[PDB]
Amino acid sequence: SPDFQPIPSFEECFPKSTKEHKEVVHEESGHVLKVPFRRVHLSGGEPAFDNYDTSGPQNVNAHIGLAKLRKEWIDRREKLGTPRYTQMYYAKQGIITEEMLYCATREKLDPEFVRSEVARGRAIIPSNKKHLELEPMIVGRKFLVKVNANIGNSAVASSIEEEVYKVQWATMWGADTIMDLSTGRHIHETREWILRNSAVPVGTVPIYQALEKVDGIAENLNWEVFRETLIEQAEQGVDYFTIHAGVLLRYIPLTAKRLTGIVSRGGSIHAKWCLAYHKENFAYEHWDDILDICNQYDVALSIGDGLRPGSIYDANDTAQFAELLTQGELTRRAWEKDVQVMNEGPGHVPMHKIPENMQKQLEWCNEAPFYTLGPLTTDIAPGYDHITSAIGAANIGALGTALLCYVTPKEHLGLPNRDDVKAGVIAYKIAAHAADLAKQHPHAQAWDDALSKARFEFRWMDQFALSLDPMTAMSFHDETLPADGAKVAHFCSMCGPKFCSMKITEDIRKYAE
Amino acid sequence: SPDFQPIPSFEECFPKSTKEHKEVVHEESGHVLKVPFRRVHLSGGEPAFDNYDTSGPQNVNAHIGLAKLRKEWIDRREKLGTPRYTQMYYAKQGIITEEMLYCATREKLDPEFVRSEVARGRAIIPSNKKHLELEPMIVGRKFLVKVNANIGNSAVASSIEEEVYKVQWATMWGADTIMDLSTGRHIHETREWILRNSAVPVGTVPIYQALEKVDGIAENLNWEVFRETLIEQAEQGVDYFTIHAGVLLRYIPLTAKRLTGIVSRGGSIHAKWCLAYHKENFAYEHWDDILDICNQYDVALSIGDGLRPGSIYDANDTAQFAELLTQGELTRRAWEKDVQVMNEGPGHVPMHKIPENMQKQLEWCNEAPFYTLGPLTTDIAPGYDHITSAIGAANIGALGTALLCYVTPKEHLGLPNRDDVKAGVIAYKIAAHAADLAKQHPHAQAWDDALSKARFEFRWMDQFALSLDPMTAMSFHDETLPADGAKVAHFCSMCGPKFCSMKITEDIRKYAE
Ligand SMILES: Nc1ncnc2c1ncn2[C@@H]1O[C@H](CSCC[C@H](N)C(=O)O)[C@@H](O)[C@H]1O
Ligand SMILES: Nc1ncnc2c1ncn2[C@@H]1O[C@H](CSCC[C@H](N)C(=O)O)[C@@H](O)[C@H]1O
Ligand SMILES: O=P(O)(O)OC[C@H]1O[C@@H](n2ccnc2)[C@H](O)[C@@H]1O
Ligand SMILES: O=P(O)(O)OC[C@H]1O[C@@H](n2ccnc2)[C@H](O)[C@@H]1O
Ligand code: SF4
Ligand code: SF4
Numbered sequence A, B: 001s002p003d004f005q006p007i008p009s010f011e012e013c014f015p016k017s018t019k020e021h022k023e024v025v026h027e028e029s030g031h032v033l034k035v036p037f038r039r040v041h042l043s044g045g046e047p048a049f050d051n052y053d054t055s056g057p058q059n060v061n062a063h064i065g066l067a068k069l070r071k072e073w074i075d076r077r078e079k080l081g082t083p084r085y086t087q088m089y090y091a092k093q094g095i096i097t098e099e100m101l102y103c104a105t106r107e108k109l110d111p112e113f114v115r116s117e118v119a120r121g122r123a124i125i126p127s128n129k130k131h132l133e134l135e136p137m138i139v140g141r142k143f144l145v146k147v148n149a150n151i152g153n154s155a156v157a158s159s160i161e162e163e164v165y166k167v168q169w170a171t172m173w174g175a176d177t178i179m180d181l182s183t184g185r186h187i188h189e190t191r192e193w194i195l196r197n198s199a200v201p202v203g204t205v206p207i208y209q210a211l212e213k214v215d216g217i218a219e220n221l222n223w224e225v226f227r228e229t230l231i232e233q234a235e236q237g238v239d240y241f242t243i244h245a246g247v248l249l250r251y252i253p254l255t256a257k258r259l260t261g262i263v264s265r266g267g268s269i270h271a272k273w274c275l276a277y278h279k280e281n282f283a284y285e286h287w288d289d290i291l292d293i294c295n296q297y298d299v300a301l302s303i304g305d306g307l308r309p310g311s312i313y314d315a316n317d318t319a320q321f322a323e324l325l326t327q328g329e330l331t332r333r334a335w336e337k338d339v340q341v342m343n344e345g346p347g348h349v350p351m352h353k354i355p356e357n358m359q360k361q362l363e364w365c366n367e368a369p370f371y372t373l374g375p376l377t378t379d380i381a382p383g384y385d386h387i388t389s390a391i392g393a394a395n396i397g398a399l400g401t402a403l404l405c406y407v408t409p410k411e412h413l414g415l416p417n418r419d420d421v422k423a424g425v426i427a428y429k430i431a432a433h434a435a436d437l438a439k440q441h442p443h444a445q446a447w448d449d450a451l452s453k454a455r456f457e458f459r460w461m462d463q464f465a466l467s468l469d470p471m472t473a474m475s476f477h478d479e480t481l482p483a484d485g486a487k488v489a490h491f492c493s494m495c496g497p498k499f500c501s502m503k504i505t506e507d508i509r510k511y512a513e
């Protein structure tokens, strides 16, 4: 029994907000779905503003875990009987599942549209039938751009208590998925506590634990070890697996002249094994067997980019695109077995090289959802790689990337702590939303408009309440003007009362009456 | 005599770096120029890495001020005699000045190319002949993307001591220009201390002090008051003036349906005056008289964007582009009198609307340098507008914007302090450099490559030394691994020794021998 400690409350993080749920009925089953959202309560006759909410159920004892909200859905489908358990299988049969309706409601889009996007491979709903605690969400270019937060220990740092805190904290600030990338002690146990306490999808990179199972000797990996690890993780409820099946033996020499070589953790492990034996990647060789596992649980496959560029110098090189071509082949093969797929992308990429990345992925991978690590647009600022990569992530998101893997201020430096997790999630929520606006995604600008209206009207508390991080905005304002009266003042300390342009506009318009 | 206190030393901010100067001779005059740069001293047989340096002369008593390095240049040109004193006038005569050669050396480009860019109006060298302390720099699309830091007091906050600290601090971290936007007490005096202690160009918005001269009553402004303010500021050495001469009477009603109205400080002041009298903007009316002042000192004109959008809702609206059209007219008129010009741009602009901004400016303003405030790509994150705008600034910089006005974490909330100044400069140096890479600017990637080589080779101290903010990178790494031995370890706490991909690549390549 770990010594779990609670994260700050929803109310402390989001003053004037309440957690709400929209109730809808899944017509085929009669199941009632409670789809979460938040409501920001405003002043001055403004209607309350409703926003997305990933924070999940609050104040739940981590020793007990979250309610198993999906239980009746899974039980009913098992009793009906089915050859495959994936959302893509159901979508292709013409079935709108509870998960699809839940996502449609959450996205304010039609359930049939969700079904269509899943059936055609252009969106995924990562939702292992063993992750009963999950509040379903959808990843795809036609939907809100989503953010992943990476957490997990290393052999050098952290603990079970701290990782559970970090999952709850990441989702509080807007993480849409998390991955447990633990490479230290207690891998299985850490992940069990996380899954039972995570309302968002949980991904892993199974080769990390496989390498642990063989005591860090990559040469002792093989398909059988890996297969056992896949089953173990699937049984716990992992919703998606990153698998570097595109790191082919013949692609490894393409990296010999790179400045930063192979920077992918899983990719480097596969490359070492391949070179040791001069054999083809065992995950590639056994792709069909991996698909058979995924079909029984609905584990989505996130096809890794083990040959992603780790420096600006290496961006968009032959190695990177050789792997992308193979990811497309693997994607099409997975779809033949109705397995949900997304593709992992770069990396360190300068801005002028970003469009080529999207163009090639959309074509070669038949519009499967893309999932990028940034990209970082420059190598010059370790300590600020949440900013160097927010630029790339926003750009590639605007071009169609569906899931943005965050990058924290600790990238290239060390394991992120709870503060770094928050900073990364905030930076990535900015990038994702900026991308939603650039895509003219329906109703995305309503958020900006509500905050800007509060800004123009000097409804300061409303402005703070509507923001991504209300207490930061409020505290920053109060550093110079802390008095209650200033929360209704028609200026702040930047310009002062006589130089505030919005107050001058106010008088300008008043005189125009 | 203010109680000036020193900023942290160059050595504390940039370990392993030295300040250096490249000596070149201005052939026409025989004047010897000492053009600053920094040198980062590296290990492992790497050559030292030379980078740009805006920090200026160090450890100089602010009561005494910087050396008047340009004195002999100005004195010689006065003795030769000239009708106009601007770099554009000299460039059009076919003269390569000390300023042009200094900039060429600093940019590693040909002096004739600098002259050509200035003569054609596509670059400016803001360099008032009364700012003798200035180390010349150039702003233009063909050059490194530059960053401006805004400082100054308000009626509500700050002091002379703190503003001088902030100028030295901003330039330490990479600010290429600063503006003294003081709207409180001691405007003249604050600016005098800043100019005498600033090695970078100093800009102002003269209407702010003009409004102060009439006790905050905009209706008591007029050309004469404004003219007196221009002369006062020019005499001190201000290198450029933001003047909102494109805020025309007939454009003001175009803002009536805006969500956030007129958010420009100077623009709102001009609009109030125009509406009060139903008269044309006096700065527009007296444009020719402003040009006559600028020609005697070489003050560059930064044509304001008083109708810039202050919310995503207002982006790229009729008001904004009406003003842009007028900025082009004003630009061409200024060039007829050989006055150097840049144009100010937005603002709050979603990413998909950024290209239109650049396309219109390049055409309508005949490729004059563009100077943007961001743009902010979303309104949702006050407290993090250095990040929301770094995205926009990088994008618009990649498309050709020459000067990026920073935005600090205090934007929309209060007056930035010294910490916020650093944060804004860092974010903007990232955006500017990312833009340099996207433009494939010569030798820009050498910086990224040097840091990435140090990263791959586990030369940790070199990696930190090469970064934008060495002590942040070092401290962050040391939070988990503080021991000296870890500075040569082939891993960090993110992956640990057995999962470090670069170490695995290392072994992979070693085995390949
Ligand atoms: N335990 C953990 N917690 C948080 N992020 C992790 C993590 N383990 C791995 N990651 C993420 O996975 C990455 C792989 S290790 C280094 C990756 C390299 N910088 C690159 O460009 O790809 C880390 O940088 C981090 O982004
Ligand atoms: N004294 C000062 N110190 C630092 N920045 C200042 C400043 N005075 C003005 N500024 C800058 O000038 C801006 C004008 S006031 C508000 C501008 C508004 N947010 C907009 O979108 O245009 C400030 O937001 C800040 O960016
Ligand atoms: O094992 P590697 O380094 O490839 O993966 C590290 C992390 O990076 C994420 N990622 C995303 C895109 N490319 C990589 C991936 O999902 C996992 O979270
Ligand atoms: O008076 P206004 O608000 O226009 O200008 C505020 C600041 O913003 C800068 N700016 C840059 C582009 N548009 C505006 C301008 O140079 C000055 O630093
Ligand atoms: S004083 Fe300036 S920064 Fe503050 S609310 Fe008014 S316009 Fe915005
Ligand atoms: S351990 Fe991981 S994060 Fe640290 S240097 Fe190695 S690859 Fe980079």
Ligand SMILES: [Cl-]
Binding pocket: A412, A413, B455
């Ligand atoms: Cl690294």
Ligand SMILES: [Cl-]
Binding pocket: A455, B412, B413
């Ligand atoms: Cl504001």
Ligand SMILES: [Zn+2]
Binding pocket: A263, A310, A348, A412
């Ligand atoms: Zn990296």
Ligand SMILES: [Zn+2]
Binding pocket: B263, B310, B348, B412
């Ligand atoms: Zn603004």
